[PDB]
Design an enzyme around this catalytic site. Structure first.
Site, PDB file in Angstrom:
ATOM      1  N   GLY A  26       0.463  -1.514  -0.064  1.00 17.23           N
ATOM      2  CA  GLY A  26       0.187   0.007  -0.101  1.00 17.23           C
ATOM      3  C   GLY A  26       1.230   1.257   0.026  1.00 17.23           C
ATOM      4  CB  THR A  30       5.166  -3.623   1.403  1.00 19.20           C
ATOM      5  OG1 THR A  30       4.981  -5.129   1.182  1.00 19.20           O
ATOM      6  CG2 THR A  30       6.783  -3.413   1.189  1.00 19.20           C
ATOM      7  CG  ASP A 139      -9.404   3.323  11.787  1.00 16.90           C
ATOM      8  OD1 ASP A 139      -8.029   2.839  10.776  1.00 16.90           O
ATOM      9  OD2 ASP A 139     -10.095   3.152  10.758  1.00 16.90           O
ATOM     10  NE  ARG A 143     -10.253   0.797   7.673  1.00 13.37           N
ATOM     11  CZ  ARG A 143     -11.342   1.046   8.490  1.00 13.37           C
ATOM     12  NH1 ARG A 143     -12.933   0.442   7.903  1.00 13.37           N
ATOM     13  NH2 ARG A 143     -11.223   2.265   8.797  1.00 13.37           N
ATOM     14  CG  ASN A 144      -8.017  -1.563  10.878  1.00 12.28           C
ATOM     15  OD1 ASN A 144      -7.553  -1.905  10.001  1.00 12.28           O
ATOM     16  ND2 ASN A 144      -8.227  -0.698  11.489  1.00 12.28           N
ATOM     17  CG  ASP A 157      -5.129   1.351  11.518  1.00  9.24           C
ATOM     18  OD1 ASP A 157      -4.113   1.496  11.969  1.00  9.24           O
ATOM     19  OD2 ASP A 157      -5.325   0.677  10.721  1.00  9.24           O
TER      20      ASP A 157
HETATM   21  C1  LIG Z   1      -0.183  -2.313   6.857  1.00  7.80           C
HETATM   22  O1  LIG Z   1      -0.973  -2.512   8.795  1.00  7.80           O
HETATM   23  C2  LIG Z   1      -2.319  -2.787   9.153  1.00  7.80           C
HETATM   24  C3  LIG Z   1      -3.062  -1.714   8.856  1.00  7.80           C
HETATM   25  C4  LIG Z   1      -2.632  -0.671   8.958  1.00  7.80           C
HETATM   26  N1  LIG Z   1      -3.743   0.031   7.940  1.00  7.80           N
HETATM   27  C5  LIG Z   1      -1.821  -2.236  10.618  1.00  7.80           C
HETATM   28  C6  LIG Z   1      -1.262  -3.411  11.160  1.00  7.80           C
HETATM   29  N2  LIG Z   1      -1.220  -5.380  10.435  1.00  7.80           N
HETATM   30  C7  LIG Z   1      -0.594  -6.138  11.493  1.00  7.80           C
HETATM   31  N3  LIG Z   1      -0.623  -5.794  12.903  1.00  7.80           N
HETATM   32  C8  LIG Z   1      -0.161  -7.014  13.206  1.00  7.80           C
HETATM   33  C9  LIG Z   1      -0.226  -8.434  12.860  1.00  7.80           C
HETATM   34  C10 LIG Z   1      -0.483  -8.277  11.266  1.00  7.80           C
HETATM   35  N4  LIG Z   1      -0.057  -9.123  10.743  1.00  7.80           N
HETATM   36  C11 LIG Z   1      -0.667 -10.132   9.830  1.00  7.80           C
HETATM   37  C12 LIG Z   1      -1.735  -8.866   8.990  1.00  7.80           C
HETATM   38  C13 LIG Z   1      -1.728  -9.834   7.745  1.00  7.80           C
HETATM   39  C14 LIG Z   1      -1.862 -10.883   7.702  1.00  7.80           C
HETATM   40  C15 LIG Z   1      -1.073 -11.607   8.233  1.00  7.80           C
HETATM   41  N5  LIG Z   1      -0.444 -10.800   9.742  1.00  7.80           N
HETATM   42  N6  LIG Z   1      -2.092 -11.105   6.010  1.00  7.80           N
HETATM   43  C16 LIG Z   1      -2.450  -9.637   5.378  1.00  7.80           C
HETATM   44  C17 LIG Z   1      -3.380  -9.976   4.576  1.00  7.80           C
HETATM   45  N7  LIG Z   1      -2.654  -9.098   6.944  1.00  7.80           N
HETATM   46  C18 LIG Z   1      -2.310  -7.434   6.211  1.00  7.80           C
HETATM   47  C19 LIG Z   1      -1.438  -6.660   5.441  1.00  7.80           C
HETATM   48  C20 LIG Z   1      -4.167  -7.308   6.677  1.00  7.80           C
HETATM   49  N8  LIG Z   1      -1.324  -6.920  10.909  1.00  7.80           N
HETATM   50  C21 LIG Z   1      -1.240  -5.263   9.190  1.00  7.80           C
HETATM   51  C22 LIG Z   1      -2.181  -4.498   8.697  1.00  7.80           C
END
Ligand SMILES: COC1(CCN)CCN(c2nccc(Nc3cc4c(cn3)nc(C)n4C(C)C)n2)CC1
Length: 300
Positions: A26, A30, A139, A143-144, A157
């Site tokens: 995004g 990444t 937020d 999605r979060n 998030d």
């Molecule tokens: C990019 O940051 C986030 C969204 C912010 N608007 C916030 C932090 N976030 C997060 N937080 C804690 C753990 C974590 N792990 C995580 C995130 C994952 C995942 C596996 N593990 N598979 C996918 C498709 N995703 C995301 C990108 C939605 N991911 C990942 C998405």
């Protein structure tokens, strides 16, 4: 005045972990699927790696890390550490099943009332914990919320958390930029709506500018097909104009727990109870040698 935040911020060496593939790209940067092989510990820990370079944006990721390193609850996503490279990388728990929003869309035909209500309870527990820590998420949305297993979700998030997503916001917030735990309740309401509709977009079509007035007129999101009035009324109470009239997270935990004891009495879903979602007691559910989940790997 307030209590000292004695959370430990862990700095990890780049060579202690490897990126495997990309999970999402995004504007922020990444996120990679990866493995963390700390020191000489004999453990591989599945991790998600969020990496970014412009100075006034590095401050925002460090702000997220600040908050994310300060939380510790089973229904909230903690920061495992950061790696200071040219870019700066947040290391987080791998949540293998992605965000709950996409999960409900892709698995609609196997999602029963037990899972939905249990998800509602877990999100409320997460949020209640954030309230104990006098933290306002600002937020909360489907999605979060992330899926560690189909039976275990966690709020993430903290990029807006303090001590714009219009269609999830309280009214006081849309018009007066006011934010409280009770404004998080509103968003909880919307989140639950998303789940009960299997991931429908709220006010799909209405442009965010019109939303403020639509809400002013007394309009609210519709009763999802599967929702008994018992469940919908809970959503609606989260969308009261008077912030203090809305339920508290502590009550939301109670109400949804009661309903989770007799799920088919509160959500009506064709084929309920004969639906199967993957479990840790399945084959192929999980190098595999010495893999340990982050939730079981503690301290330096
Ligand atoms: C990019 O940051 C986030 C969204 C912010 N608007 C916030 C932090 N976030 C997060 N937080 C804690 C753990 C974590 N792990 C995580 C995130 C994952 C995942 C596996 N593990 N598979 C996918 C498709 N995703 C995301 C990108 C939605 N991911 C990942 C998405």
């Amino acid at each position: 005045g307030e209590a000292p935040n004695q959370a430990l911020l862990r700095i990890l060496k780049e060579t202690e972990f490897k990126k495997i593939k990309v999970l999402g790209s995004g504007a922020f940067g990444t996120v990679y699927k990866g493995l963390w092989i700390p020191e000489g510990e004999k453990v591989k820990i599945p991790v998600a790696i969020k990496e970014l370079t412009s100075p006034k944006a590095n401050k925002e990721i460090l702000d997220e890390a600040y908050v994310m390193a300060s939380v510790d609850n089973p229904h909230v996503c903690r920061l495992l550490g950061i790696c200071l490279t040219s870019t700066v990388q947040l290391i987080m728990q791998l949540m293998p099943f992605g965000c709950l929003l996409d999960y409900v869309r892709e698995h609609k035909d196997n999602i029963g009332s037990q899972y939905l209500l249990n998800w509602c309870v877990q999100i409320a527990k997460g949020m209640n914990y954030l309230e104990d820590r006098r933290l306002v998420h600002r937020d909360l949305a489907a999605r979060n919320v992330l899926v560690k297993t189909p039976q275990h979700v966690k709020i993430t998030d903290f990029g807006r958390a303090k001590l714009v997503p219009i269609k999830w916001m309280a009214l006081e917030s849309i018009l007066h930029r006011i934010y409280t735990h009770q404004s998080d309740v509103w968003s909880y309401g919307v989140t639950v709506w998303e789940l009960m509709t299997f991931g429908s977009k709220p006010y799909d079509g209405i442009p965010a500018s019109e939303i403020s007035s639509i809400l002013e007129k007394g309009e609210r999101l519709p009763q999802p097909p599967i929702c008994t009035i018992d469940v919908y009324m809970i959503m609606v109470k989260c969308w009261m104009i008077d912030a203090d009239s809305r339920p508290k997270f502590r009550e939301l935990i109670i109400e949804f727990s009661k309903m989770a004891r007799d799920p088919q009495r509160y959500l009506v879903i064709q084929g309920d109870e004969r639906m199967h979602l993957p479990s840790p007691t399945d084959s192929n559910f999980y190098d595999m040698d010495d893999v340990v989940d982050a939730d079981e790997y503690l301290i330096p």
